[PDB]
Amino acid sequence: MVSLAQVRGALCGALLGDCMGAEFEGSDAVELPDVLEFVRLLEKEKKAGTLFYTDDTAMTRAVIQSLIAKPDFDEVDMAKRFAEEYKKEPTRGYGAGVVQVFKKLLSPKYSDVFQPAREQFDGKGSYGNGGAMRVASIALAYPNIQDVIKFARRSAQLTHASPLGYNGAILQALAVHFALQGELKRDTFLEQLIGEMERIEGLPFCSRLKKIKEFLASSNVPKADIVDELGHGIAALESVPTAIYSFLHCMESDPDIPDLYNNLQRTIIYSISLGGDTDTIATMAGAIAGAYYGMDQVTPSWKRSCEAIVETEESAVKLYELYCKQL
Numbered sequence: 272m273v274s275l276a277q278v279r280g281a282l283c284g285a286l287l288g289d290c291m292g293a294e295f296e297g298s299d300a301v302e303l304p305d306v307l308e309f310v311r312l313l314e315k316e317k318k319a320g321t322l323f324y325t326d327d328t329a330m331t332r333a334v335i336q337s338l339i340a341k342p343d344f345d346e347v348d349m350a351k352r353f354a355e356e357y358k359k360e361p362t363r364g365y366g367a368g369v370v371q372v373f374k375k376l377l378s379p380k381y382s383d384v385f386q387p388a389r390e391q392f393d394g395k396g397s398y399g400n401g402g403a404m405r406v407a408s409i410a411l412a413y414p415n416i417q418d419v420i421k422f423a424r425r426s427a428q429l430t431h432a433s434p435l436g437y438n439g440a441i442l443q444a445l446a447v448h449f450a451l452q453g454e455l456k457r458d459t460f461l462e463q464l465i466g467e468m469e470r471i472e473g474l475p476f477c478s479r480l481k482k483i484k485e486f487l488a489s490s491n492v493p494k495a496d497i498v499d500e501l502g503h504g505i506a507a508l509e510s511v512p513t514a515i516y517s518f519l520h521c522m523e524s525d526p527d528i529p530d531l532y533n534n535l536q537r538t539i540i541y542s543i544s545l546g547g548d549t550d551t552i553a554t555m556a557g558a559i560a561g562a563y564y565g566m567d568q569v570t571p572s573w574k575r576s577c578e579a580i581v582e583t584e585e586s587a588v589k590l591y592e593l594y595c596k597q598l
């Protein structure tokens with residue numbers, strides 16, 4: 272039985288990952304000591320809301336507003352909200368490509384809201400993680416896996432028309448889905464994901480998911496090896512599996528991370544420690560961790576530092592109602 276605590280956990284986890292990840296974004300070597308210092312300073316900050324969220328959260332909030340306005344899923348309403356949000360706050364840190372999608376939706380020239388995304392990169396569409404970064408809410412609003420899949424795909428295809436783009440969104444949404452279903456063991460969790468992705472792709476994402484299995488079966492896997500094989504890039508293929516690994520890895524102790532950090536905190540710290548697109552990787556791993564461990568692991572000293580923490584917590588209630596309605 273999914274609880275409010277898990278839905279709120281997911282969203283607050285996504286918000287923390289974004290806000291804290293943003294601070295290290297695009298450094299392709301990050302050092303864990305920097306992350307630990309950052310976190311310690313964060314806990315001591317007397318002023319609340321010192322960390323601003325980025326496009327990841329901006330788009331997340333737009334998804335949520337759309338689901339609440341239109342619980343049956345309205346891709347037209349959603350597209351409009353994405354475009355209006357971009358227009359309202361263009362400097363939140365959007366990918367250079369996706370900006371063109373928003374401008375086409377804002378223009379009066381397109382009646383098919385999917386068409387701008389189809390036109391990206393000489394008709395190939397974006398392979399970026401921007402579809403995945405905002406998708407978690409689909410899993411929080413829709414209990415049935417078939418809904419999760421088709422709405423993850425469609426929400427993603429508003430900006431990401433490449434299969435790599437939108438299958439990454441599907442994968443991230445499935446990861447959050449299976450994290451919500453209670454205390455799944457690692458092996459079953461991955462079996463669940465590999466099962467679904469073979470059908471969906473049938474295989475880039477399955478390949479990476481298989482390597483994740485491999486890695487988890489080993490111990491003391493260098494971060495370099497994780498980055499080398501799974502990636503830490505703005506591409507969905509190189510970020511969504513990496514987020515899933517971070518979550519799965521951080522279900523147990525990491526020798527480098529003090530055990531006085533809880534699992535969700537560990538998850539965020541570890542994600543950021545991998546470098547690259549740290550905002551987006553941490554927001555995704557954080558969403559999965561939040562869903563799994565819930566709000567009890569979203570500590571007051573961490574969350575209070577995030578722009579829009581209050582609004583986010585409020586929004587969780589409305590999402591949770593959607594979820595409950597669907598049962």
Ligand SMILES: Nc1ncnc2c1ncn2[C@@H]1O[C@H](COP(=O)(O)OP(=O)(O)OC[C@H]2O[C@H](O)[C@H](O)[C@@H]2O)[C@@H](O)[C@H]1O
Nearest residue numbers: 364365366367368369392395396397398399400401505551
């Ligand atoms: N098919 C392609 N061919 C060549 N380059 C591509 C392709 N697809 C993507 N790129 C490159 O990938 C870039 C971004 O793709 P975009 O769809 O704009 O962005 P996003 O929404 O996925 O956001 C990605 C992250 O960026 C921000 O930090 C957010 O926080 C996310 O973390 C393009 O400019 C291209 O260089």
Ligand SMILES: [Mg+2]
Nearest residue numbers: 325326327550
């Ligand atoms: Mg961002």
Ligand SMILES: [Mg+2]
Nearest residue numbers: 296548550551
């Ligand atoms: Mg980013």
